[PDB]
From a paper:
80α is a typical example of a staphylococcal transducing phage, capable of transferring non-specific chromosomal or plasmid DNA at low frequency. The capsids are assembled from a major capsid protein (CP) as empty precursor procapsids into which the DNA is packaged through the portal by the phage terminase. Many SaPIs, such as [name], redirect the 80α capsid assembly pathway to form capsids that are smaller than the normal phage capsids and that are thus incapable of packaging full-length phage genomes. Here, we report the structures of a mature 80α capsid made from an uncleavable version of CP at 5.2 Å resolution and of a wildtype [name] mature capsid at 8.4 Å resolution.
Reasoning that empty particles would be more amenable to 3D reconstruction, since the lack of internal DNA would reduce the background noise, we chose a sample in which the majority of the capsids had ejected their DNA upon prolonged exposure at 22 °C. The reconstruction reached a final resolution of 5.2 Å by the FSC0.143 criterion. Compared to the procapsid, the mature capsid is larger and more angular and has a thinner shell. No density could be assigned for the N-terminal 30 residues of CP, including the N-terminal 14 residues that are normally cleaved from WT capsids. In the mature capsid (which has no SP), the β-strand folds underneath the E-loop that extends from the adjacent subunits, while α1 is rotated by 81° towards the outside of the capsid relative to its orientation in the procapsid. This is accompanied by a straightening of the spine helix (α3) and major changes in the preceding α2 helix and the P-loop (green in Figure 6D), presenting a concerted rotation of the subunit that leads to a disruption of the α-helical palisade seen in the procapsid. During maturation, the CP subunits are rotated from a perpendicular orientation in which the A domains protrude on the surface of the capsid, to a lateral orientation in which both A- and P-domains lie tangentially in the plane of the shell. We hypothesize that this rotation is triggered by the release of the N-arm from SP, thereby coupling the capsid expansion to scaffolding removal.
Residue numbers in the entry:
A (entry chain C), B (entry chain B), C (entry chain G), D (entry chain F), E (entry chain E), F (entry chain D), ...: 35 to 309
Write the structure that this text describes.
Amino acid sequence: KDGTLMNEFTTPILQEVMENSKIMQLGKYEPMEGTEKKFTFWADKPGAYWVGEGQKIETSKATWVNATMRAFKLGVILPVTKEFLNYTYSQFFEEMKPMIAEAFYKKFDEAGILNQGNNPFGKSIAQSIEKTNKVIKGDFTQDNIIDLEALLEDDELEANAFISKTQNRSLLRKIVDPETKERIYDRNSDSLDGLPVVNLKSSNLKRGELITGDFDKLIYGIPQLIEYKIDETAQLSTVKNEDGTPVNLFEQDMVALRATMHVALHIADDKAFAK
Amino acid sequence: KDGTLMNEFTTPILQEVMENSKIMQLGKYEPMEGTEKKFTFWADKPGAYWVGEGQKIETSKATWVNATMRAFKLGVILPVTKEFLNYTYSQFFEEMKPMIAEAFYKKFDEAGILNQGNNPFGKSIAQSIEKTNKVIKGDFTQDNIIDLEALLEDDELEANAFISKTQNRSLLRKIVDPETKERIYDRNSDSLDGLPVVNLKSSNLKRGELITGDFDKLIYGIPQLIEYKIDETAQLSTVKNEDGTPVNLFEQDMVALRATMHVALHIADDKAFAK
Amino acid sequence: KDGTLMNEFTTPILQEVMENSKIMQLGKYEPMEGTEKKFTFWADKPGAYWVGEGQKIETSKATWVNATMRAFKLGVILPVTKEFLNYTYSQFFEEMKPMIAEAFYKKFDEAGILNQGNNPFGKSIAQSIEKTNKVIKGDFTQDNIIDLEALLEDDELEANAFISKTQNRSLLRKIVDPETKERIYDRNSDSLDGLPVVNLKSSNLKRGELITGDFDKLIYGIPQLIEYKIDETAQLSTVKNEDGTPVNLFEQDMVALRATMHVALHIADDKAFAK
Amino acid sequence: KDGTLMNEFTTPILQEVMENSKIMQLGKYEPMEGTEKKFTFWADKPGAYWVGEGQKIETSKATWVNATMRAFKLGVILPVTKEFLNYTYSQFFEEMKPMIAEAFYKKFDEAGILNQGNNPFGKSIAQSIEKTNKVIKGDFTQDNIIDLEALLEDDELEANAFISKTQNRSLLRKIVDPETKERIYDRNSDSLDGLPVVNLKSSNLKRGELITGDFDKLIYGIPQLIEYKIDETAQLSTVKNEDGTPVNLFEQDMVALRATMHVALHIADDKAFAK
Amino acid sequence: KDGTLMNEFTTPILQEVMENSKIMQLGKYEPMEGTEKKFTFWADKPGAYWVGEGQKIETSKATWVNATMRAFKLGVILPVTKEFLNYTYSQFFEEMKPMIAEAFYKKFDEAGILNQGNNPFGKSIAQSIEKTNKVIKGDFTQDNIIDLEALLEDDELEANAFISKTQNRSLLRKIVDPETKERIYDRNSDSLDGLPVVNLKSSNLKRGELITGDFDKLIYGIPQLIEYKIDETAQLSTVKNEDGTPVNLFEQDMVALRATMHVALHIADDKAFAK
Amino acid sequence: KDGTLMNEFTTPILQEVMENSKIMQLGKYEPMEGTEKKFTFWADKPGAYWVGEGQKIETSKATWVNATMRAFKLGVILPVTKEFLNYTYSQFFEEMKPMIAEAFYKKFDEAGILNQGNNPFGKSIAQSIEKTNKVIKGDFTQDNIIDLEALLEDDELEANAFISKTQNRSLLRKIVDPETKERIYDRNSDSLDGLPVVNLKSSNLKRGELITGDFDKLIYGIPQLIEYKIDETAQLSTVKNEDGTPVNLFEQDMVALRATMHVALHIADDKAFAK
Amino acid sequence: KDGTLMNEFTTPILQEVMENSKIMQLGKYEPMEGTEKKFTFWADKPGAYWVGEGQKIETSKATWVNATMRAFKLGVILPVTKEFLNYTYSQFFEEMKPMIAEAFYKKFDEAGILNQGNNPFGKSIAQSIEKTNKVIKGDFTQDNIIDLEALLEDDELEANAFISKTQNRSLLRKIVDPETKERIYDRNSDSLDGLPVVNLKSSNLKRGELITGDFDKLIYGIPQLIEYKIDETAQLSTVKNEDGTPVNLFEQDMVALRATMHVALHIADDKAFAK
């Protein structure tokens, strides 16, 4: 069990959607360190004569919580000896240094886009649904999607683009208005009211389109580094038993990433509710 | 509390609120205390040739009380001490003068278009609801929006621009007529039915566009500051707080912007009512 | 009486009603001395190898209408004495030449609809409704508006222009036809109706919309006149004995305009009535 | 009694009546005193290796009628004295020859296109409605208008041109269709039907479309010279007493016209039903 | 009595009906009256370590059919005596060959389009509708016309051209269509559902949408004059012979046409039915 | 009964349409039986200054099917004696190789896209559509057609064209989009949204189109092999009766062309709702 | 002659009428439609070194009343014929306009000072009767005249000149008493209390002297309308008595002016009372 030589390559199933995950979130400006904060609150009070009204404005909301990339894998442990012996599995791990790094890049944006993904904690849509009642309950319609865009507009803002899941994109494109097109019906993605939609692969989102405005994407950069020591799930091949093993044999490259997502005031959400 | 070495940042909202205050209201400039407005009506003569019938009416309108801009409080006082010590906070104090100037029009629009803190006797919606009930009850529709414009135009007038809210912006986009697909909100130009309409973004207005013809903007400018003594004083952790608290040293920045608005006694409104 | 300063004079409202009055109801500015005449001829015969019988017609038309003039009188009584002392009241009567012109144009255009002073041959709409039925009680419809235009087109000649009030203009824009291409509304063009529509603000019409074939308008009259009262509506100033008679006046400015309205053969009529 | 100086007829209805009276309604006009039209019916019979029998016969129909425009009575009698004295009335009588020429077309169309105007040697829609019916009377609708074209195809198998009536255009425009085309005419389109035809003035027919395809209106019509003796109607009063009609001195212009209409059993007529 | 007289017969609208039969069929001319075959094709599907099993064989259909063109009877009896004395009636019988050819095409088309026309064995419209429900029963609709083509597509056959009638053209135009464009009878291309449709004169049944795929055109030729012996349709006393023998009279003018048509079960003709 | 030689060949306008069915689906050809496998996402870490997660996906995919062109005997029994004696039926069996190839393309597509056979079985497009439940309930409408194309583009890559069944193509031709453009129809090439829709002759597919772009199509080659010794009996008789097929010359040739198809869950299809 | 005049002469004692014009002066001259507001005293107190406490006040004047000068009665009618015929009397009427200008100033000053026949509310004697009486009169005395100025000084007001009638001037200057004080007379003008004062020609009582402090002068000019209309209001006797109707003949000129005197808080006035 676990240890066979065979040619394997991953293509356009998850890696294609991974590269555009944070770009769909619209990461306006990438900061060096997690210290980006908004200060303006805007204060004024109108009187008439012989009166002095006071005004105060001071705010700071910085986002800094690094999320690591994938370490040495249990499946790659059986393939590590195949990497040393054959050229096929070595090129597979070298392609993984970009493919699985993109998967770590995908899950980092998914932490903000979905509440179930916990890494950044208190960022984008994950913080939006809990703090503000922006999510519309029920079936996503052409009028309901514009009503979802109203929730993003309610906090003195405007929605840029709506992030769509693999199953949520079908339900959004199915709905069409009484007279207006709404569902595009040509080649382009179906718009909620006017703004274009971008696809983002998610595990939590199934029905309804969530829209994000201004939430920054800033990172140290998801890389790859070859190492000998990594503690995870135990793996054994022949004449060996592993219980507290980490440093003994090299399985896969311990990739390093330090990513952060800037928190927004209000971002739109949509979900199907049944009782 | 400390309050030292901080970077002040402004979000893209103050620039939009300041420009739309008088532009949506169509406030004509007048260099006088209060306001003066005129209205005239002439009479016609009979069919038979002998003598011509005279008597012609002349009516005048005036507005009172110009709302003054609010001075800086304890929040800006903590930053002004940092402005004297640090180079970065010194430019922030001058930027605070410009931000409050934008907020001065924001309070003027709240007093002008809405009845949130009425400084003038005719406050668009307050002038409508008290004198002539032209407001349409119920949900906003494309047929109902033109009918709302019909309510203002019936009393010898014409609808120029409908003041849009944050929730009303996307509510107009959702609205569509039985035959006509026109709504105008997602596009660069937004109109109620045909004639151009600008968004006001007010705390008092909840849902529904409110049309208005002519108004006034007088003697308005920007904040004048040098050295000011506070009267009431907001509660703060930094520096001493007292009942008769004022500062001789640089802490508070004074403001000077007085403006008054006149009503034509014919303006439309829209609001949702529960069945 | 009070008195008070005139300050300023309005022009904005009267300017729109003055220009559109003569062009309304398909107006023709054709020069006529005293009265204009129109004639029509008809013949009918069929037969062979026998005596022939023929017929001939000669029609006569008359249009005799007098000038519309208005003095300063009881209406501008507080401004008549104020003309000698204040600069605003003196310039008011000179500017009233264009304001009373709007009133002189107001009665001439209203005579086509109905009006109190019927200078013309009855009324261009009332005599047309008595000759041919076109008006329907209830509510004006978009399909019915095309039928109303066809109602004038059926008798004698095809209709070109449809006259409408300010309240009717907003009501016609609210109305939409069964086909998308058929309905024009407020969104497309200045005119709501399909055919050429002219705005005429009058108390006699008040939401009706009636069409006309072809009617002529001939106007000639200078606005320069000054005399010591003739009509006398109400007493002025109150300081001397005896009040009522038109004898002895301090200041009065009269403006005359002699205009004759020529009757059309066939026109349309439409009015709304509550059930 | 007493008529001088003033002359010239405007002729608003006579100008358009001459164009589409017989020219639009009928296909071709081939000049003859008694024109004859022919039609052949082909025979066909199929069988298995036997003799083929089938009688084919050609049926011909002749049309001969002379409808001349007569010299005018009563009206021209007062005008003849004015023609001899004044140059204006003499030129008016020569222009009346061209006006009566249009009236001769009006009398020809009344008994040629319309049902029973002068009843000039039968034919017209009157012959079609009595012998073969083909009218299908009812309410004027979009389905009923197509049924009029279908009635011509059911009896003779020939497509018919649009109606030449202005009073029927009012009933035609009021009709609404499920399709976007609607078919209304007058507002933008020349004709509601498939083919294009101009509306003509009707004296006998009140309401309903007069659609006819293949027809013949052969004519030899021209204005004739005025003679000394004529008797038709009322005699004119002057210095010498006269009661019996003979003219003697006064002259009225006649016309020599021979117009005939040919039938083809393909004409549409609509009539309103009320019980 | 039937008196012989010199008269030229008109070609009328019947001359265009000749080309309709072959154009609606859209089939190649076969060298002789025989048989046309079509393959059934297709074999059993995929399988490893298994038997192949049998496949379908080609099936031939009957293409040869008996037909006859009728000769002129007692209808051309008065014309035969006029042919001997005058050159006009003699040239009329030679020109009647083209008229008889139109009748010869009319009999062939009547079998393919209708059940009332009896000539060909196994009617194209009648037998196909009886064997399988392809023809629409009830009200004529634009959506129902596509449904008739869909019934033909169920048997793996695409409709090339729709068989149009003069009565059916007005019925198809009156039917409401979901599309904003709308074809309506004929404009330039004339389409029933999508592809181009040809008009055909049909006295039998009529007033219903018909569609056709591929029907055979066959060799026959035109008229062959002999002027001897006849079956005799009308008996008469002096104009025609009582006994069917014709003796030596040249009223016969024999015609030769033995054509045929064979088509697959795809063509269907809709018919109106009363509830 | 009766196995007589006819010496007649039947082909074209049936075999040509079936050949373009399976190849138009667009898939990469593979040398041996076995599909290309792709790994599905590697797991990621969430925390900083910790061990990190380690998991990688293993790729798995397979496609194995051996297709064959069937040897005919059920219909080739009479044709076997005709092939051995006459050159026409012998050349017909060689031309039947192109007919069997059409069946080989038909069986490859019908098992996948329509699930008529179980050749693909596991990797069948219709079976995958049932497993995914992406099918739209109801009639094939313009709104449903755009939703069907979007259903594939949401889950995976956007499909090129929706696979038609000719009968479904005609029903979809009746439906047209909201914008001024007809969907598919019969202009030049039928298209669902982008690329040209491939019509496939199917027994299972009748109404509703399935959209698949990334579906594999691979074959061993073309079907051509020798004929020797009888197998699988359906019908065999001429002079002596037989129960089981053995001995003598073969009726039609069994031909080898092993084809297999792999799927990636893209097809959706549409089913009509019945109550 | 009664009405007829040959030689016209200028009016005697012209300097006395001009002296009354200059007498109506105490508190400047300002031209307006009504009365202009004059600000209060506003005093300030020294108090101490550090604390700065004072007072500021503003007073307002009510805007009312304007001047008028009317046409002369009876005597003007005699002068009307003389002015029209002779150039010398016409120049005398223009010189009479300057004499009536002196009378216009005389009327406004006299009615304000005595009898209260002015339109102006609160002036000299009318101001004393409404607010507070300063001096009581019975017998003319030197001590009583000094007490009148002391009564005005008690309400904080300094008098510059005491205007009085010609009958009261001699009584105030010279009085039989024990000791005489303050008279002047020989220097420039006779004094009542101890200041130089001008006497005005007015219809006033001989017993009782009046004193003025501050009263505003206002004017709009003199002699505006020269040509007179119909005379009816004035009582005429010369040449022809006018009561009802009168032709266009100028008798006397109409003069236009506007006067309003500012109401003083303290003004001295004395009125005679019986014992």
